[PDB]
């Protein structure tokens, strides 16, 4: 019911479509009036993703856009999983599904964590690629394994592959 605008960007992973309202970013989708630099969520999201890919050493300098997908508008374990992942798991780190489950308030709910991650509407920004099965097992990805491994390699992680 929000008044939605969209923008596209090029990335090493193909074209990304951003959609959002004045209250926040809604979605980042892999497709395979505002000026850049502005405070509008879509513009902040654009800036953040471009820095992620092209100036990753500066990534913490960039404002994280407000998020307004309906999954962020109400309390839930799914929201806890997404927000805790965003808040806690930094560029270049990973966390296991099981430790994220505990972080999000339900230790041992690994399958529910996986379901929440599959429903992440803002991939890369909320870093579902940094959630792994265990120390030697990168686990699965809603976007596909090759993408998960590529992102981890971009961030210099041991579990990265490209």
Q: Which of 125, 128, 132, 152 is the catalytic position?
A: 128
129 is in an annotated binding site: no
**Residue 73 beta carbon to Zn ion: minimum distance, rounded to whole angstroms:** 8
**Residue 26 beta carbon to Zn ion: minimum distance, rounded to whole angstroms:** 6
Question: Which residue, 69 or 154, has its beta carbon nearer to Zn ion?
Answer: 69
73 lies in the site for Zn ion, by CB under 5 A: no
Q: Classify residue 133 as exposed, middle or buried by CB count within 10 Å of its CB (0-12, 13-18, 19+).
A: middle
69 is in an annotated binding site: no
Q: Mention every residue, 6+ apart, whose C-beta is less than 8 A from residue 21.
A: 2, 3, 4, 5, 41, 68
Question: Which residue, 42 or 94, has its beta carbon nearer to Zn ion?
Answer: 42
Rule CB under 5 A: choose which of 5, 7, 11, 21 binds Zn ion. 21
Rule CB under 5 A: choose which of 8, 12, 15, 23 binds Zn ion. 23
Only one residue has tokens 């074209």, namely: 15
- The H helix count followed by the E strand count for the chain is 5, 5
Question: What are the C-alpha distances in Å from 51 to residues 64, 96, 101, 124?
Answer: 11, 26, 29, 12
Helix axes 110-118, 77-88, angle to 10 degrees: 80
Annotated binding site: 2, 21, 26, 68
Which residues of the shown chain bind Zn ion in the complex (CB under 5 A)?
A: 2, 21, 23, 68
Annotated binding site for Zn(2+): 2, 21, 26, 68
Active site (catalytic) residues: 128
């Amino acid at each position: 019911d929000c008044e939605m605008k969209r923008t596209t960007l090029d990335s090493p992973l193909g074209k990304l479509e951003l959609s959002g309202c004045e209250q926040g970013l809604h979605e980042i989708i892999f497709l395979g009036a505002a000026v850049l630099g502005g405070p509008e969520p879509l513009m902040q999201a654009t800036a953040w993703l471009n820095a992620y890919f092209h100036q990753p050493e500066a990534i913490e300098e960039f404002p994280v856009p407000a998020l307004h997908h309906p999954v962020f508008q109400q309390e839930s374990f799914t929201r806890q999983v997404l927000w805790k992942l965003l808040k806690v798991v930094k560029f270049g780190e990973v966390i296991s599904y099981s430790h994220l489950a505990a972080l999000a308030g339900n230790p041992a709910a690994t399958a529910a964590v996986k379901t929440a991650l599959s429903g992440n509407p803002v991939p890369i920004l909320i870093p579902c690629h940094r959630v792994v099965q265990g120390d030697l097992d990168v686990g699965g990805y809603e976007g596909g394994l090759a993408v998960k491994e590529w992102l981890l390699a971009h961030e210099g992680h041991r579990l990265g592959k490209r």
